C-alpha cells in the first residue's frame, strides 16, 4: 500500500498529461491491489490471508 501510493504520487507529479496521470494511477492501484491481494487474480491469496487473520483473531480471543 505505502509503496504503491508513493509511486502513484511520484508518477502524478511527473505526469505530462491527464491520460498519463490516469494510466499511472490505475497501474499503481492495480499493483497495490495485487500485492495487497486485493486484485481479482490474488483472490485465493486474499482468502487464505483472511482465513489466517480469522484464525489469529480466534487465537487472540
Amino acid at each position: 500500500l505505502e509503496c504503491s501510493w508513493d509511486e502513484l504520487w511520484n508518477k502524478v507529479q511527473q505526469a505530462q498529461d491527464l491520460d498519463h496521470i490516469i494510466a499511472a494511477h490505475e497501474v499503481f492501484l492495480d499493483t497495490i491491489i495485487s500485492r495487497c491481494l486485493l486484485d481479482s487474480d490474488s483472490r485465493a491469496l486474499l482468502n487464505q490471508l483472511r482465513a489466517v487473520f480469522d484464525q489469529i483473531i480466534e487465537l487472540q480471543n
Binding site: 500500500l1 502513484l8 502524478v12 491527464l18 496521470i21 490516469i22 499511472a24 494511477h25 490505475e26 499503481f28 492501484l29 492495480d30 497495490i32 491491489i33 495487497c36 491481494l37 486485493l38 486484485d39 486474499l46 490471508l49 487473520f53 483473531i57
Partner: protein, 61 residues
C-alpha cells in the same frame, strides 16, 4: 484526535473516514471496517472507481 492524525490538514482529514459495511449478526469489525478515499472530478480520472475500490480493499485488509 488521540493520535498524530489530528495533525493532518483539515482537507486531508475530512477525506479520511470510517466506513461501516452492511452489519450482519456475527460479523466482527474486522469484516466491515474500511478506510475510504472519496475521488471526484479530474482526480476521479486517475483515482477511478476501480482504483478507489482497490485502495479501500487494501485499507480494510
Amino acid at each position: 484526535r488521540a493520535t498524530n492524525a489530528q495533525f493532518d490538514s483539515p482537507e486531508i482529514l475530512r477525506r479520511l473516514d470510517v466506513r461501516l459495511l452492511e452489519v450482519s449478526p456475527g460479523d466482527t469489525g474486522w469484516d466491515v471496517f474500511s478506510l475510504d478515499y472519496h475521488v471526484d472530478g479530474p482526480i476521479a480520472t486517475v483515482f477511478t472507481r476501480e482504483c478507489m475500490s482497490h485502495y479501500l480493499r487494501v485499507f480494510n485488509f
